């Protein structure tokens, strides 16, 4: 038969399942809703491990349970009473013999040790992947250190001593590749001559590579703590979502820089060279699976100041119009082709983050925190699972590093890019649109001519890489 359990009066996690405390979705069960006690029981269940539930729960639990309360509950879960001797054990002891203790040994092996190990696995994952709870609450860390440091008994000892060391390392806190990265490419600007760096003087291949390294690093730095609770939209967004906002502000600045490069090139022939170079950068972004970069270019080309430059458009080669068209088509029909492409490529890649943000926000706004059943309020866990499916997808693309060499000066150039200067956003985007009107006036005003501004050759070196010995 099944193992008997402690009385639910001395150990709360032995209460029977019912629809008043847990609801399953229609080979392990999937939880739709439950009390916090039932969620923690299933988080640390004696019959099976559920590592994706551990991640889901530790990512999302703060919407229904405070960190201090979670720790109290898993300590309570850990402290399992052992059963008393059975009648057969009693009779053995009365005869001066050693009892077999069969039921006690089974309960230790099949209930206590798995539940206790799974509690420790929650602690291990909490410290390793959600350490911000402890960075923000020193007393919580003290409690965790004390709990782990006072677990007795040899069955758990290896993991207790390990988790103690992991905590101490987290308090004070290298890549290998299948091949060598390709050689850094140079065009008009030569190494060390940062003062000449610009859109047309750096090599377009290397512009795309260094922006991809920068944008990959920005993508990889965003933690789930910046996303759950929709905190990047709320009044404290600068406190709670700083890496996400840095990533978005880079994307915005690059889009505006592309627009500024275009409309501040008043000579038509030179402006065609600028737009053609930006489409070449887009081509390399596509080759690198940098979808953030792809959309940075698409957003610039579809902006009000650039979109209307029909005289510039007319001179762009057909093959480049086709590249831009197929990049824009990724975004059509609610990103249908983008989503399919992201799921088909071989990483590394840089996803576009905005879709994830909208899906997390709408999942949190469109589903209730609790379900009411039989007069009880149950935590709606399905809603949290949906959010954690999105954060899990984000994390999956954060693992793979690009095999590209950093160029420190080109990296610094793009880190320090500031197209708006000291101007406010409305000021600056009105300026860009007025420049567009200046360089290609609305019909029927005649098209003026403008002097050249670039003293160096406009011919692109192209985007196929070179390889000397």
């Amino acid at each position: 038969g099944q193992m008997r359990l402690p009385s639910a009066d001395v150990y709360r996690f032995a209460e029977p399942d019912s629809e008043e405390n847990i609801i399953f979705e229609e080979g392990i069960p999937i939880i739709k809703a439950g009390t916090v006690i039932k969620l923690i029981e299933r988080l640390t269940y004696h019959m099976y491990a559920d590592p994706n539930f551990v991640r889901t729960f530790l990512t999302t639990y703060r919407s229904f349970c405070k960190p201090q309360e979670l720790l109290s509950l898993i300590i309570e879960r850990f402290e399992i009473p052992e059963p008393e001797p059975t009648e057969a054990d009693r009779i053995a002891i009365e005869n001066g013999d050693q009892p077999l203790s069969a039921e006690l040994k089974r309960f230790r092996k099949e209930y206590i040790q798995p539940v206790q190990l799974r509690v420790l696995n929650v602690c291990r994952h909490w410290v390793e992947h959600h350490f911000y709870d402890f960075e923000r609450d020193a007393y919580l860390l003290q409690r965790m250190e004390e709990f782990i440091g006072t677990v007795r008994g040899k069955a758990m000892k290896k993991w207790v001593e390990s988790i103690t060391k992991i905590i101490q390392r987290k308090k004070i806190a290298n890549i290998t590749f299948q091949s060598s990265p390709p050689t850094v490419e140079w065009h008009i600007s030569r190494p060390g001559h940062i003062e000449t760096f610009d859109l047309l003087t750096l090599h377009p291949i290397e512009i795309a590579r260094q922006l991809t390294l920068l944008e990959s690093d920005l993508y990889r730095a965003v933690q789930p703590s910046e996303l759950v609770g929709s905190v990047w939209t709320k009044e404290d967004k600068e406190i709670n979502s700083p890496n996400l906002l840095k990533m978005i502000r880079h994307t915005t600045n690059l889009t505006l820089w592309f627009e500024k490069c275009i409309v501040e090139t008043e000579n038509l022939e030179e402006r065609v060279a600028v737009v053609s170079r930006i489409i070449e950068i887009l081509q390399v972004f596509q080759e690198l699976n940098n979808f953030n970069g792809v959309l940075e270019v698409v957003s610039a080309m579809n902006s009000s100041p650039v979109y209307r430059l029909d005289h510039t458009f007319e001179q762009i080669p057909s093959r480049q119009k086709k590249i831009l068209e197929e990049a824009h088509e990724l975004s059509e029909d609610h990103y249908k082709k983008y989503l399919a492409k992201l799921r088909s490529i071989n990483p590394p890649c840089v996803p576009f983050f905005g879709i994830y943000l909208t899906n997390i926000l709408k999942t949190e706004e469109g589903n209730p925190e609790v379900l009411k059943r039989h007069g009880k309020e149950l935590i709606n866990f399905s809603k949290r699972r949906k959010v954690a499916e999105i954060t899990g997808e984000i994390q999956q693309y954060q693992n793979q590093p690009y095999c590209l060499r950093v160029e420190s000066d080109i990296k610094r150039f793009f880190e320090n890019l500031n197209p708006m200067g000291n101007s406010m956003e409305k000021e600056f985007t009105d300026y860009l649109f007025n420049k567009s009107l200046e360089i290609e006036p609305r019909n029927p005003k005649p098209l003026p001519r403008f002097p050249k501004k670039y003293s160096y050759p406009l011919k692109s070196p192209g985007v196929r890489p070179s390889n000397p010995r």
């Binding site: 889009t255 959309l295 957003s299 709408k362 589903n367 999105i390």
Partner: protein, 167 residues
Amino acid sequence: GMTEYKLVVVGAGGVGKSALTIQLIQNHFVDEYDPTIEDSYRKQVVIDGETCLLDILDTAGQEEYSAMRDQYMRTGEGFLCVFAINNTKSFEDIHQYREQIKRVKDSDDVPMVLVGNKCDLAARTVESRQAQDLARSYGIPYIETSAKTRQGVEDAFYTLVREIRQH
């Protein structure tokens, strides 16, 4: 077959804007949503006896991608300009959203509605007379909606479709 209308929701973030489309497209009568589901933003409706398909773009959550606004807005035939009735700044933002829509569409007469959204029980700071006066100064309808009871939601979208049909 039936006409499809591409509608675009615009407005300040962080103040419950997304509730408007969620409540519309929702299983009206089950409070639940999966936005990742292909066509959680398409809805067949009958407006004044004429069946049509609404395709709604709501990029709620992407407000910091400010250089993408033109890209997103360009797709739309009609616009819901949404502010929160307890957030004066979101109401003051409306003028610039409308100017940006006019520029992207290259038209002084773009179908649009002004929507005042009640997103919580915090005290109202934009009175309905202020919003009516603003809408009248623009020549567009004003609709107030609740983010919790679905009141006004159908009216906001149907009124916009009528603006498109009567353009």
